[PDB]
Design a protein around this ligand. Structure first.
Ligand code: POV
Ligand code: POV
Ligand code: P2E
Ligand code: P2E
Lengths: 272, 272
């Protein structure tokens, strides 16, 4: 019972709150560019997901059974839905930003003059409503949310329960595929411009390349074990699945740092 | 066995490295003496984490300390815990006296403060803490294996004298730090009320800085020092939580002094 400890949810709630609050504080001070707008609501998305989820886990620990706390399973269905909504939201808000950076450097002339904040609100609103619509399936009969080991959290049941558990996994793999494909394309598109002009111009490219590669590293470390393990169960088992959902939750903790806060700490054929 | 988990030392080693490395990076970029003392404080905390955590991880992954250490490593482990624990406690206490004497006489402090004094205070604390930790090797005290067999520390039951000398030294370091900060806060608000948004903005920001130092130290170090005193004059479980809370102070050090300011950066009577 090494993983059964309230020290993890309490630590994850405090670090997630502080990181996401500092991010929302800086964006309110600076503006409202669209990149600042998308990061501000991404930090707000991750924080709400942590406040709606973690306090329930702490109560179950300090009380010592989910069944006697939740008769009829009213709270468990809400818990599993909130896990699915905010999990997919972070995955696809990041995928949207990957397409933004790809189309920005591909055409800085048209992007710097035709990008509007009304498009940013449309993409943020579309991801929210689409992810909520998918999480409503177990309430509508397609899928089921059940209590997971060790009785302190609810998630998608893995054994049309197997179809719904498979639709979530491929959606996550899709979000990582779009994010990794656009970032690698942006890195190559950025280095080619640096090699055509050839310390200011080359310094920005390497700093931006580290930014894109770091995003891929966090996502692949945090989300891969959970998505892969779900696929293995559809087609120690209780123990490793708890570590995986905690690693997936870590991605929403590291989000404000990989996008905004680390840049601020390090901020501040000679022009070359 | 909720506290017996390698997830804590691994997590604490990575967060401690990142925080202290970013601190050392910023001070090198900017050798004032306040920047110098923070730079070597972050270097102290990192070395203490690098000398201690890798041993704990091996004991976890191997599944007994005795068969691994036929007690040469255990004595070195307890000494390193004592050296770097006291160093952080009294380097912070030294800085508290620096801020007290700086605002008390900004005229003499801004003209007579030299970097050779900063190196003398940093060197004195290091050698004094090493001298105290050498006592168990010299016969006064003892380092023993602690529950659950993954770390060594001062035995608590002249073993009782040496265990009591460590606890009172910690209470002394918190007393000096809390006394100087409260005096500095009062001296700063009184100067702000004599001139009466720029001048009042600096005072409140510095007051939050001083109060935050007191909150971290009292939360991280109080349970360990008090619990040792209770045992000299669940017992295995709470003592592990206490030494992990004391270690948390060295993780939060680079943020409470340097990194949080960087993220948030930028009757005499806009100057007020
Ligand atoms: C900014 C960057 C900071 C990153 C640092 C993160 C490193 C944190 C790494 C780990 C930190 C080490 C904490 C040691 C606690 C161990 C407790 C234990 O063993 O399990 C017991 C838990 O029962 C409890 O008592 C829960 C106590 C929760 C306190 C955890 C620290 C909270 C601060 C969070 C950190 C500060 C957040 C705010 C910082 C501004 C037994 O549980 P059970 O009964 O079996 O159920
Ligand atoms: C600025 C940063 C602020 C954010 C701070 C994040 C706070 C993170 C708070 C807590 C995060 C917890 C993550 C889930 C881990 C669960 C593992 C578990 O349950 O115990 C198992 C451990 O056995 C293992 O498998 C070890 C795995 C180590 C992963 C721990 C995270 C390491 C990264 C570091 C994470 C920080 C990232 C570092 C770089 C930023 C059981 O062990 P056993 O009983 O011995 O068998
Ligand atoms: C699929 C994952 C999406 C979740 C997104 C959300 O932002 C994360 C919430 C986490 C947060 O890190 C703290 C916490 O405990 C929440 C629940 C995560 C795992 C439950 C483990 C229960 C236990 O500790 O026993
Ligand atoms: C007296 C305190 C001085 C220690 C200062 C040093 O900076 C802290 C080192 C910590 C670090 O946070 C990770 C770690 O495990 C080191 C040892 C701390 C507790 C041992 C518990 C062993 C276990 O987990 O089982």
């Amino acid at each position: 019972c090494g993983s059964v400890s309230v020290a993890f949810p309490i630590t994850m709630l405090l670090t997630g709150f502080v990181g996401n609050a500092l991010a929302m504080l800086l964006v309110s001070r600076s503006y409202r560019k669209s990149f600042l707008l998308c990061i501000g609501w991404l930090a707000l998305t991750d924080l709400v997901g942590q406040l709606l989820t973690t306090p329930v886990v702490i109560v179950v620990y300090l009380s010592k059974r989910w069944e006697h706390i939740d008769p009829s399973g009213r709270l468990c269905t809400f818990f599993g839905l909130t896990m699915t909504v905010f999990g997919l939201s972070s995955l696809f808000i990041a995928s949207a930003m990957a397409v933004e950076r790809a189309l920005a450097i591909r055409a800085p002339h048209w992007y710097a003059s035709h990008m509007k904040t009304r498009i940013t609100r449309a993409v943020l609103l579309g991801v929210w409503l689409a992810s909520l619509a998918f999480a409503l399936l177990p309430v509508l009969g397609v899928g089921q949310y059940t209590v997971q080991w060790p009785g302190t959290w609810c998630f998608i049941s893995t054994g049309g329960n197997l179809f719904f558990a498979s639709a979530f996994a491929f959606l996550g793999l899709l979000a990582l595929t779009v994010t990794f494909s656009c970032n690698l394309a942006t890195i190559k598109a950025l280095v080619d411009r640096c090699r055509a002009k050839a310390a200011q111009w080359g310094r920005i490219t390497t700093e931006t390349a580290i930014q894109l590669m770091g995003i891929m590293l966090v996502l692949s470390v945090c989300w891969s074990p959970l998505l892969i393990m779900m696929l293995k169960m559809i087609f120690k088992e209780c123990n490793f699945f708890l570590i995986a959902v905690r690693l997936a939750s870590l991605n929403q903790i590291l989000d404000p740092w990989v996008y905004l806060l680390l840049r601020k700490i390090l901020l501040r054929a000679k022009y070359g």
